[PDB]
Amino acid sequence: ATGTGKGVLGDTKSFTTTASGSSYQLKDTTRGNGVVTYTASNRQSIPGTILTDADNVWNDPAGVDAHTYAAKTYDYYKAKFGRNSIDGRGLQLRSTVHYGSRYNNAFWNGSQMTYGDGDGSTFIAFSGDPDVVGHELTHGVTEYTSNLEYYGESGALNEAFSDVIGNDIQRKNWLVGDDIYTPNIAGDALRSMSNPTLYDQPDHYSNLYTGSSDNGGVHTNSGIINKAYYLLAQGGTFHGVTVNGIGRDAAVQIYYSAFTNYLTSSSDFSNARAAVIQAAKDQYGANSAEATAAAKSFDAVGVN
Ligand SMILES: CC(C)C[C@H](NP(=O)(O)O[C@@H]1O[C@@H](C)[C@H](O)[C@@H](O)[C@H]1O)C(=O)N[C@@H](Cc1c[nH]c2ccccc12)C(=O)O
Ligand SMILES: [Ca+2]
Ligand SMILES: [Ca+2]
Ligand SMILES: [Ca+2]
Ligand code: NA
Ligand SMILES: [Zn+2]
Numbered sequence: 278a279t280g281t282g283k284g285v286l287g288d289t290k291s292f293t294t295t296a297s298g299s300s301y302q303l304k305d306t307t308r309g310n311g312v313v314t315y316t317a318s319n320r321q322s323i324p325g326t327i328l329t330d331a332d333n334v335w336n337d338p339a340g341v342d343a344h345t346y347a348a349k350t351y352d353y354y355k356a357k358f359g360r361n362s363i364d365g366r367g368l369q370l371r372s373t374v375h376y377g378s379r380y381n382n383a384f385w386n387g388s389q390m391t392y393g394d395g396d397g398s399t400f401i402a403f404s405g406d407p408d409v410v411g412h413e414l415t416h417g418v419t420e421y422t423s424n425l426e427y428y429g430e431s432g433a434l435n436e437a438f439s440d441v442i443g444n445d446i447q448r449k450n451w452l453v454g455d456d457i458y459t460p461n462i463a464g465d466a467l468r469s470m471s472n473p474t475l476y477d478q479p480d481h482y483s484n485l486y487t488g489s490s491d492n493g494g495v496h497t498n499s500g501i502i503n504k505a506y507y508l509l510a511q512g513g514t515f516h517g518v519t520v521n522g523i524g525r526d527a528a529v530q531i532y533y534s535a536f537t538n539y540l541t542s543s544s545d546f547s548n549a550r551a552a553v554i555q556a557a558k559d560q561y562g563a564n565s566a567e568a569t570a571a572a573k574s575f576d577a578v579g580v581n
Pocket of ligand 3: 406407408409447449453454455456
């Protein structure tokens with residue numbers, strides 16, 4: 278069926294649903310084994326119950342965005358990388374919205390994506406930025422490919438890859454989480470890829486977080502890798518090293534290959550340098566502009 282309704286930002290959009298007797302479920306059976314979207318009804322059981330509406334015009338901004346952006350992320354992965362869902366084999370894409378009460382996170386749990394509402398102050402509903410939905414679904418792709426451990430450098434690569442892909446889906450700017458962060462302040466963001474230190478993440482390896490919080494700083498140290506990606510895609514001069522940019526289209530293909538074909542669950546930043554250089558070489562040639570740019574980008578952020 279064709280359902281319609283507003284996302285978290287108030288924008289009307291359509292999406293596929295299923296008619297069940299007298300009403301409609303937020304379930305699209307036309308993409309792999311499905312895209313299906315649930316409410317946890319402000320408690321913490323997941324998946325919860327499948328969202329329903331009587332007339333197929335939806336009034337649940339969180340669910341409309343979680344569903345629509347899962348479907349858009351499905352299509353982006355098949356169009357851009359030839360991958361069929363998270364496992365490459367059409368794994369059903371399940372999302373739960375209204376997890377808990379004023380809950381300020383979102384997460385991938387090894388099976389589905391889950392989205393809090395936010396407290397209304399720091400965050401609004403998390404499904405409202407396509408680059409957050411991207412970020413969550415990409416943790417799933419990671420699990421099925423490199424299977425990067427969730428601690429120290431490995432866990433930071435895990436997060437940077439989710440930021441790279443989430444951001445690349447929307448391509449609005451170099452920000453992560455900007456649609457859902459601090460509703461009362463325009464222009465800010467949860468993270469910046471172009472300028473990570475703006476949001477207290479390091480952008481150079483000499484400033485690596487070495488404490489034990491946050492699984493050894495997996496959401497902090499990802500800023501190094503995000504900076505490397507940005508320098509490869511955009512170009513720039515940083516710590517004296519000039520990187521000639523190669524554009525997002527080329528950079529994301531190199532990253533996608535590096536993180537899904539070359540990295541393993543124990544990879545550290547140094548292995549990521551090598552995977553990125555290797556993918557650059559596969560795709561463009563050992564001595565190409567792109568393979569040189571892949572090297573400089575890691576030089577510039579101090580990952581040797
Ligand atoms: C895309 C972003 C909107 C959500 C994103 N959640 P994500 O990284 O998928 O998931 C989180 O981290 C993983 C490593 C754990 O496995 C998960 O259980 C979850 O804790 C994140 O960057 N979370 C950060 C930032 C953050 C979110 N809410 C916050 C509230 C306060 C401080 C920081 C935060 C974090 O948990 O740190
Ligand atoms: Ca309705
Ligand atoms: Ca965004
Ligand atoms: Ca804001
Ligand atoms: Na799990
Ligand atoms: Zn994450």
